[PDB]
Structures are given as C-alpha cells and as structure tokens.
Design a protein around this nucleic acid. Structure first.
Length: 50
RNA sequence: GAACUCGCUGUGAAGAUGCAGUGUACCCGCGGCAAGACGGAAAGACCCCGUGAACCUUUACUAUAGCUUGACACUGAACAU
C-alpha cells in the first residue's frame, strides 16, 4: 500500500517516498525489519520530524 | 362358550356328535389302537393387498463425503520477453 521508506533503499527510494507497493513486499521485509512504516497519516509527520 | 359328547342317507357358509328322516344303543370304569374333530413340528411354507417397513444392486431420480479443475486470499522482489 502506502508505506514510506527510511533507508538507503534500491531504485524506488530517496530516503522517504510515497509509493504504491504490494502487501506481501510490505510485511516481512519492510514492516518490522526496519526501512519502512505504514502511512496511516499520523506517521507522515512523525518520522519526517525525526 | 356350554353339553344329557351314537351310526347312516340327505340338506346346509357347499365334508354335521347337535338340522330332517331313519337305524341302533342298560348305567359307569379300566387297559389299548390313532379313524375324525382339538393340538403339536404352530403352513413363521405357498399368494394377493396396503399410495406398509427394511436392507441390497445399477448407465433410476435428487443430494452428499472423498477425489479433481480454475479463480481469489495466505503470496514476494529483481531481470528478460
């Protein structure tokens, strides 16, 4: 879905991008291993402040 | 069911101890033979009926477990076409 990147990711990422990703590549790789977070419109200001 | 519980011919729900005709027979036990009724091995074998029941078979009908097919979900990324 709408996850935002956080790292030195390959060629879809620029340290934070709103992309259209699938659910299976979202969880177990990008959810809790690091590097992403689901964009529930509360975290879009919270981690950009970080 | 009750009996004071004879044999013939005939009649009769059509094979009569009981009806009609006729014949015979003192009253009552006992031991036997099984011909009739009455039971037994019960014909719990033969047949029909019920818009009865039960199992069983199948290319009866309608379903279903199982097996099997595809879609979607669990389920992703890099390339090449």
């Amino acid at each position: 879905m709408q996850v935002i990147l956080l790292d030195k990711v390959a060629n879809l990422g620029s340290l934070g991008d709103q992309v259209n990703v699938k659910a299976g590549y979202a969880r177990n790789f990008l959810v809790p291993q690091g590097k992403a977070v689901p964009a529930t419109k509360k975290n879009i200001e919270f981690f950009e402040a970080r």
